Symmetry: C3
Subunit: 114 residues, 3 copies
Amino acid sequence: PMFIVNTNVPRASVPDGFLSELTQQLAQATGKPPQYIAVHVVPDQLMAFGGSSEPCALCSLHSIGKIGGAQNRSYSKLLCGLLAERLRISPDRVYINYYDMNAANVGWNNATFA
Amino acid sequence: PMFIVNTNVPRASVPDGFLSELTQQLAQATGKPPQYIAVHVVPDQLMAFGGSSEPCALCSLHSIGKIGGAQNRSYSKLLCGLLAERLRISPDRVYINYYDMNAANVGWNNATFA
Amino acid sequence: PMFIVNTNVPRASVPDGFLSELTQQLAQATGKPPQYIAVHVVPDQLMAFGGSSEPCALCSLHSIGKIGGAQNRSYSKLLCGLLAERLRISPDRVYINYYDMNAANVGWNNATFA
């Protein structure tokens, strides 16, 4: 799985250890080993949500499976929780796009996951 | 809706007010309330289009519905027009990927839109 | 086609000529003329792969057709090979998400590719 968060919160406001926390929590949530979890945090962005530049985040979770209505509700609670606690972003200023990737549409280690 | 633009145009070349202009015009074009429109502009990027590093942009528009051939044509005219007028990017140097998101695949405010 | 690499490798480690090399090789791999290939490299990112921050990359390749299991295996060999040779990223620390875009879902030059 791969999780990306783009935010206007400044770099100094991202706590040390945040990448590791995301990795651990996403390994637990998705059920996948942490070795297969990739995380990417992009602070200091020029962005707005609802016309406002108060803190916000635009995120993506890509996984081969482990994506669906109920799972995505749980992921949203988890990840909005983390973003609120760690980055002080209101959950109602977070969008998370979920992508259920076909194995053959993910490249890794010179080939695909098919 | 979520609109992201990545460009090699420099930050100083992005006019004041641009994120609000985008928000307003996207709310109108998609029919969605402005409170649901997110916009993100990423200048000073290392990119090329057709092998050239003249001004260009790589963009995405995600929406829960309001995506299709005629709508996307309309969006492209709008957005290429704004990138040309405001960022001086030629329309033939812009790619915009459109995504029709299922409501269950968009997280927001601790849950999804499903 | 549009290729985007996000990596923690520092900008100074991206060799001169890299965007052109990507453009040339992708034109060739996809069979599409280089005038239609866009490339984007984002260095200096805050990311982790498998819980660690050695060099890694998170990438995407979007194309109107030319996407499928065999083709994507070919692309992954090519692109991991370039990322290893030029950026010294291990192929096992690269993910590439592949997207087969419908022509009507790609904006360009004030309209779509439909």
